Amino acid sequence: PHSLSYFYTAVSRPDRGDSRFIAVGYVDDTQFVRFDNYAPNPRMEPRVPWIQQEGQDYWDEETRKVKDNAQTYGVGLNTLRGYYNQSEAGSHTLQSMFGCYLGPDGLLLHGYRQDAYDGADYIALNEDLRSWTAADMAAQITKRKWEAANVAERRRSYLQGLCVESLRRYLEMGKDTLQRAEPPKTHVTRHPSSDLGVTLRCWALGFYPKEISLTWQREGQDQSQDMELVETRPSGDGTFQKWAALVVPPGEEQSYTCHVQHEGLQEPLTLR
Amino acid sequence: ESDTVGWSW
Amino acid sequence: ARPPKVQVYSRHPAENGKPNYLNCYVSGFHPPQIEIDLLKNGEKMNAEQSDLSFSKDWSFYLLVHTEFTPNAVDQYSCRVKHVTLDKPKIVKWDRDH
């Protein structure tokens, strides 16, 4: 299912009581907008070609809304500083992620909104979009506040309405690219770099979306081999790459196989 | 398009 | 606080004399204040930095990247400064990683 997601970061300053606010928006794993309130006369800005098909009215309205949101997060930094009895001497962070997944009927499939303070879970909208889960006792204060004010219905109205409708609009606007998965381009490299043995490295490059599985298998053993596995990383052009490596005895390279799973592949892939 | 976040924590 | 993990790598398999793109991916860190430099032979390269974003566990990630053409002699690296690091973390680019 396609998704539309926003990631908000607010950071307080040990300084003049103001705060930095950064917002990024994604359709699936494709970033399409950004906002940064330290830019002069800050605007929501395009970050992918297809969203540049929007008129200036769109950018004006998105700018208005995200500037208001940044104000709200500025106040929230202070409030949470109070909840946790922290001084105004240090910098703190308030993060939110929210968004919607599109169902098979063109309606909301799953929606979410989650907040973290100083990098730890703070409060989350539950799957039913009508109740909250608080992570500690300060979050209980926030939860009582939002329950009494039916903030959950604000979230649910957005996720079931504007979120999915704007996502469908985006999928049509970027139909030339957003409907594409890119399968990994794969190869195995061999590095006889040590007396310890021969390093085999299985590479997957240029794939999209970012979810992938690379595993090494040795003939005669069912379990995956222990391996050196790097975290999935961006290629810079919107795709991703990953590799998995291990050291094998000098003459035994042929008994090892790298197995690749990605949604762009028409069958699971076995490499040597 | 963005949510409208306005309620205090 | 969570320290950054640092990866330095090319967009395509590197070939001497073939234009390419050099990436320094910095991830898993918290708080978000961080200084990231791509270095060519120890000198800071002019490089773009991605917009600040984060993962499902709330840790931040940034990509710093630029064009480059590998050759036989030039060495490339990435230097990162963060509150969790007593000394700047330097990761050297290698075309096998």
Author numbering:
A (entry chain A): 2 to 273
B (entry chain C): 1 to 9
C (entry chain B): 4 to 100
How do the authors describe this structure?
MHC-I is a cell surface glycoprotein that is responsible for the presentation of both endogenously and exogenously invading pathogen-derived peptide antigens for immune surveillance. Peptides anchor the antigen binding groove (ABG) via interactions between peptide residues and pockets, denoted A–F. Polymorphisms alter the stereo- and electrochemical environment of the pockets, dictating their ability to accommodate different peptide residues, thereby influencing the nature and quantity of the bound peptides (4–6). The key residues, residues at positions 99 and 156 (residues 99 and 156), adopted two distinguishing manners to alter the peptide binding plasticity of SLA-I molecules, and their molecular mechanisms were further demonstrated by the corresponding crystal structures.
To explore whether the 99Tyr/Phe micropolymorphism influenced the P1 residue, we created a mutant peptide ESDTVGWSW (EW9 for short), which was only P1-Glu different from the NW9 peptide, to test its binding property to SLA-1*13:01. The mutant peptide EW9 could easily renature SLA-1*13:01 as expected. To understand the mechanism by which micropolymorphism 99 affected peptide binding, two complexes, SLA-1*13:01 with peptide EW9 (pSLA-1*13:01EW9) and SLA-1*13:01 (F99Y) with peptide NW9 (pSLA-1*13:01 (F99Y)NW9), were crystallized. The comparison of the peptides revealed a significant difference that 99Tyr could form a hydrogen bond with the carbon backbone of P3, but 99Phe could not. To understand why EW9 can stabilize SLA-1*13:01 but not NW9, the force between P1 and the A pocket was analyzed. The CD spectrum showed that the salt bridge between P1-Glu and 170Arg almost compensated for the loss of the hydrogen bond between the backbone of the P3 residue and 99Tyr. Thus, the absence of the backbone hydrogen bond between 99Phe and P3 residue should be compensated by other pockets to some extent, even if the affinity is not be the same as before. In comparison, 66Lys,70Asn, 73Thr,155Arg, and 156Arg from SLA-1*13:01EW9 were stabilized the peptide conformation and required additional hydrogen bonding force to pull down the peptide. The peptide conformation of pSLA-1*13:01 was almost the same as that of pSLA-1*13:01 (F99Y) (RMSD = 0.175 Å), but it was quite different from that of pSLA-1*04:01 (RMSD = 1.110 Å). Therefore, other pockets must provide additional binding to maintain peptide binding, such as the salt bridge between the P1 residue and Arg170 in the A pocket.
